[PDB]
Design an enzyme around this catalytic site. Structure first.
Site, PDB file in Angstrom:
ATOM      1  CG  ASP A  63       2.725  13.844  10.228  1.00 27.70           C
ATOM      2  OD1 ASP A  63       2.935  14.947   9.674  1.00 27.70           O
ATOM      3  OD2 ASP A  63       2.817  12.766   9.609  1.00 27.70           O
ATOM      4  CG  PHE A 119       9.185   6.696  11.059  1.00 28.27           C
ATOM      5  CD1 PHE A 119      10.313   7.482  10.856  1.00 28.27           C
ATOM      6  CD2 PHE A 119       8.931   6.210  12.338  1.00 28.27           C
ATOM      7  CE1 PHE A 119      11.172   7.777  11.907  1.00 28.27           C
ATOM      8  CE2 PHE A 119       9.782   6.501  13.393  1.00 28.27           C
ATOM      9  CZ  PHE A 119      10.906   7.286  13.179  1.00 28.27           C
ATOM     10  N   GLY A 120       8.351   3.221   7.963  1.00 30.47           N
ATOM     11  CA  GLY A 120       7.497   2.103   7.600  1.00 30.47           C
ATOM     12  C   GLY A 120       7.223   1.759   6.142  1.00 30.47           C
ATOM     13  CB  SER A 121       7.157  -1.069   4.254  1.00 27.33           C
ATOM     14  OG  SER A 121       8.464  -0.568   4.042  1.00 27.33           O
ATOM     15  CD  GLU A 162     -10.149   0.298  12.511  1.00 27.55           C
ATOM     16  OE1 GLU A 162     -10.182  -0.163  13.673  1.00 27.55           O
ATOM     17  OE2 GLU A 162     -10.945   1.180  12.113  1.00 27.55           O
ATOM     18  CG  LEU A 165      -2.088  -0.988   1.228  1.00 27.16           C
ATOM     19  CD1 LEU A 165      -2.647  -1.136   2.630  1.00 27.16           C
ATOM     20  CD2 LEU A 165      -3.169  -0.529   0.275  1.00 27.16           C
ATOM     21  N   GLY A 166       2.102   1.167   0.413  1.00 28.45           N
ATOM     22  CA  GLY A 166       2.953   2.347   0.422  1.00 28.45           C
ATOM     23  C   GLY A 166       4.071   2.270   1.440  1.00 28.45           C
ATOM     24  CB  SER A 167       7.150   2.141   1.964  1.00 26.98           C
ATOM     25  OG  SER A 167       8.023   2.625   0.954  1.00 26.98           O
TER      26      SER A 167
HETATM   27  N1  LIG Z   1       3.397   6.213   7.947  1.00 24.05           N
HETATM   28  C1  LIG Z   1       2.402   5.651   7.761  1.00 24.05           C
HETATM   29  C2  LIG Z   1       1.170   4.948   7.505  1.00 24.05           C
HETATM   30  C3  LIG Z   1       0.567   4.804   6.173  1.00 24.05           C
HETATM   31  C4  LIG Z   1       1.105   5.330   4.977  1.00 24.05           C
HETATM   32  C5  LIG Z   1       0.621   6.579   4.427  1.00 24.05           C
HETATM   33  C6  LIG Z   1       1.162   7.110   3.230  1.00 24.05           C
HETATM   34  C7  LIG Z   1       2.197   6.414   2.551  1.00 24.05           C
HETATM   35  C8  LIG Z   1       2.696   5.191   3.059  1.00 24.05           C
HETATM   36  C9  LIG Z   1       2.159   4.651   4.256  1.00 24.05           C
HETATM   37  C10 LIG Z   1      -0.658   4.073   6.103  1.00 24.05           C
HETATM   38  C11 LIG Z   1      -1.275   3.505   7.284  1.00 24.05           C
HETATM   39  C12 LIG Z   1      -2.498   2.774   7.246  1.00 24.05           C
HETATM   40  C13 LIG Z   1      -3.173   2.534   6.003  1.00 24.05           C
HETATM   41  C14 LIG Z   1      -4.378   1.824   5.929  1.00 24.05           C
HETATM   42 BR1  LIG Z   1      -5.194   1.580   4.218  1.00 24.05          BR
HETATM   43  C15 LIG Z   1      -4.979   1.308   7.095  1.00 24.05           C
HETATM   44  C16 LIG Z   1      -4.368   1.508   8.347  1.00 24.05           C
HETATM   45  C17 LIG Z   1      -3.152   2.228   8.435  1.00 24.05           C
HETATM   46  O1  LIG Z   1      -2.652   2.366   9.706  1.00 24.05           O
HETATM   47  N2  LIG Z   1      -0.639   3.697   8.460  1.00 24.05           N
HETATM   48  C18 LIG Z   1       0.494   4.356   8.624  1.00 24.05           C
HETATM   49  O2  LIG Z   1       0.934   4.408   9.924  1.00 24.05           O
END
Ligand SMILES: N#Cc1c(-c2ccccc2)cc(-c2cc(Br)ccc2O)[nH]c1=O
Length: 273
Positions: free
Chosen positions: A135, A17-19, A89, A12-14
């Site tokens: 944020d 701070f995370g993927s 979720e 979904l993205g990265s």
């Molecule tokens: N940082 C971050 C985070 C995200 C992100 C946003 C934009 C680009 C890449 C990743 C997405 C989520 C996230 C996405 C969904 Br569908 C459902 C629950 C989530 O908790 N959490 C993050 O904590």
């Protein structure tokens, strides 16, 4: 056993701070989001009721988890040699405020009112739980298209709420307040209100108001789109240079432009279906 309970899916993205991946709880097909965080990038750690060292993110999410689905809910989490994995979720269909605004451009005030109101309820929920997001922005807001409900996500730059001054910040710069840019100091609620001010502007104009530090410290707000007088007023109020001159959450929700907000479902039926 993480990989045994969930069925990992697409990325979904990265970021720094995370993927995040899209998974499904094998157990009941429940749609979830799987977030991977490397222990290295993690800056803040906490413990919560247990005395177990965990990243602040987990602490915050646990403190705000509840029936109120104004904020994303942590379903579970696992620790690994070099990273932590969070199970959030995942609503579907869903879209984030950034993408939604990027497609529809400026939003009608009525819709921006519903959305803005929902964000305010969520942020209030967090503060109420002792959590400060740090944020707040279109990217960290999810839209449950069916029920027309928004969700706050990504507490990765968060922190426990306090009344004393903050000297650290790792949120989005263009959403940070004048006091941070200049003295590298700020207070939670007032700093939050400032970013809420940037957010509202973003919703009604289709883009943020400030791009450079100079513009931020100057705080002169120009509207590129036709915006009501009432909305312009609430916006300039949230973006007041002096922190103490900014409205309280209570004052924002009692502001004239915030009246007669639509119900979430109504919002979906009128602006999402
Ligand atoms: N940082 C971050 C985070 C995200 C992100 C946003 C934009 C680009 C890449 C990743 C997405 C989520 C996230 C996405 C969904 Br569908 C459902 C629950 C989530 O908790 N959490 C993050 O904590």
């Amino acid at each position: 056993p993480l990989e045994s309970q969930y069925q990992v899916g697409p990325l979904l993205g990265s970021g720094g701070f995370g993927s995040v991946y899209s998974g499904i709880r094998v157990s009941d097909n429940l749609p979830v989001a799987i977030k991977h965080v490397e222990k290295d990038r993690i800056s803040d750690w906490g413990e919560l009721p247990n005395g177990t060292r965990v990243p602040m993110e987990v602490v915050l999410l646990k403190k705000v988890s509840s029936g109120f689905s104004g904020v994303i809910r942590l379903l579970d989490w696992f620790e690994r040699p070099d990273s932590f994995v969070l199970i959030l979720e995942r609503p579907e269909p869903v879209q984030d405020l950034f993408d939604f605004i990027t497609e529809r451009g400026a939003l009608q005030e009525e819709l921006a009112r519903s959305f803005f109101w929902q964000v305010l309820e969520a942020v209030r929920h967090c503060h109420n739980c002792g959590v400060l997001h740090r944020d707040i922005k279109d990217e960290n807001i999810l839209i449950d298209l069916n029920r027309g409900e928004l969700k706050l996500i990504d507490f990765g730059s968060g922190a426990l709420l306090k009344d004393t001054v903050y000297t650290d910040f790792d949120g989005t710069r263009v959403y940070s307040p004048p006091e941070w840019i200049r003295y590298h100091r700020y207070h939670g609620r007032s700093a939050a209100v400032w970013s809420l001010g940037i957010l509202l502007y973003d919703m009604v104009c289709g883009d943020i108001p400030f791009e450079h530090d100079e513009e931020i410290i100057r705080g002169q707000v120009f509207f590129r789109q036709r915006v009501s007088s009432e909305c312009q007023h609430l916006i300039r109020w949230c973006l007041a240079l002096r922190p103490s001159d900014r409205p309280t959450f209570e004052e924002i929700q009692n502001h004239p432009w915030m009246q007669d907000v639509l119900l979430p479902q109504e919002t979906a039926e009128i602006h999402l279906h």
